[PDB]
């Protein structure tokens, strides 16, 4: 099916960290209005990642998804320190289509299955942050701080086995580089899973998306290149369609 273009939003205290350059918006740093705007100009799905401090976090994330679900009609994902089934459950019930987990999944893979058994696999997104170490792709947790010693190939297979719906494949080797998506990593992972693969980290120009899709990604996620208007979302989809990529245009 159609290749997907995702926008990611980083959040703290109900605000978009670093905001955005869309001066047409009432509040360029308002996650809800920005999300709604993206949904209007052609983003296919949104993802919200919250880094609010522990005291206010739960209520902040629940308010956000509630407001977002009311204002937008495309699927969205919420994530950020989701550590257990009850937290994931209340976010989905409150309005999220999907939850994103990473570290908590690595430490308890059955959490994937737990969430999927009530909300279906399609509600579970596993973010995998991977990096080359001595010639092998390794899984990293705790915001890139911990080398788990787990091989990417092994974790990808387990993640599907546990019942995840899709995988976000984040290349730590491409963090803030604008040199392109890690297409070697995408090609490496593609044969190991039937799940949708969402490319993340590295995007700097429209051609990088084409490359990502050629590598076998089902979706491409970016943030700052969208928010600071280095890449126009509408042009991006036009470009991709131009060169043969199937994108979308009770």
Q: What is the DSSP string of 92-108?
A: HHHT-SEEEESHHHHH-
Is the CB of residue 61 less than 8 Å from the CB of residue 50? yes
124-133 and 98-101 beta bridge pairing: parallel
Q: How many domains does the chain have?
A: 1
Domain limits at 231?
A: 1-250
Domain at 17, CATH number: 3.20.20.70
CB atoms within 10 A of CB 203: 28
Instruction: Provide φ and ψ at 136, rounded to 5°.
Output: -120, 145
Distance, C-alpha 235 to centroid of its chain: 21
- The experimental technique behind this entry is X-ray
Answer positive or negative: Cα dihedral of 30, 32, 35, 41.
negative
The per-residue b/e assignment along 41-51, b for 16 or more CB within 10 angstroms, e otherwise, is ebbbbbbbbbe
Give CA angle at 192 (170, 236), nearest 5°: 45
User: Residues near 250 by Cβ (< 8 Å), separated by ≥ 6?
Assistant: none
Q: How far apart are CA 218 and CA 17, in angstroms?
A: 27
């Amino acid at each position: 099916l159609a290749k997907r273009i995702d926008a990611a939003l980083i959040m703290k205290d109900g605000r978009v960290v670093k905001g955005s350059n869309f001066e047409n918006l009432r509040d360029s740093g308002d996650p809800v209005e920005l999300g709604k705007f993206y949904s209007e100009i052609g983003i296919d799905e949104l993802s919200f990642w919250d880094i609010t401090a522990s005291v206010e976090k739960r209520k902040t994330m629940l308010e956000l998804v509630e407001k977002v679900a009311e204002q937008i009609d495309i699927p969205f994902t919420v994530g950020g320190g989701i550590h257990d089934f009850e937290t994931a459950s209340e976010l989905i019930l409150r309005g999220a289509d999907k939850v994103e987990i990473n570290t908590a999944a690595v430490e308890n893979p059955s959490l994937i299955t737990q969430i999927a058994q009530t909300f279906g696999s399609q509600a579970v997104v596993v973010y995998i942050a991977a990096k080359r170490v001595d010639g092998e792709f390794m899984v990293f947790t705790y915001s890139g701080k911990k080398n788990t010693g787990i091989l990417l190939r092994d974790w990808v297979v387990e993640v599907e086995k546990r019942g995840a719906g899709e995988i976000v494949l984040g290349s730590i080797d491409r963090l803030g580089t604008k040199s392109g998506y890690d297409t070697e990593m995408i090609r490496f992972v593609r044969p190991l899973t039937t799940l949708p693969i969402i490319a993340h980290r590295g995007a700097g120009k429209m051609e990088h998306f084409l490359e990502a899709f050629l590598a076998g990604a089902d979706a491409a996620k970016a943030d700052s290149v969208f928010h600071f208007r280095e890449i126009d979302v509408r042009e991006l989809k036009e470009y991709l369609k131009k060169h043969g990529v199937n994108v979308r245009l009770h």
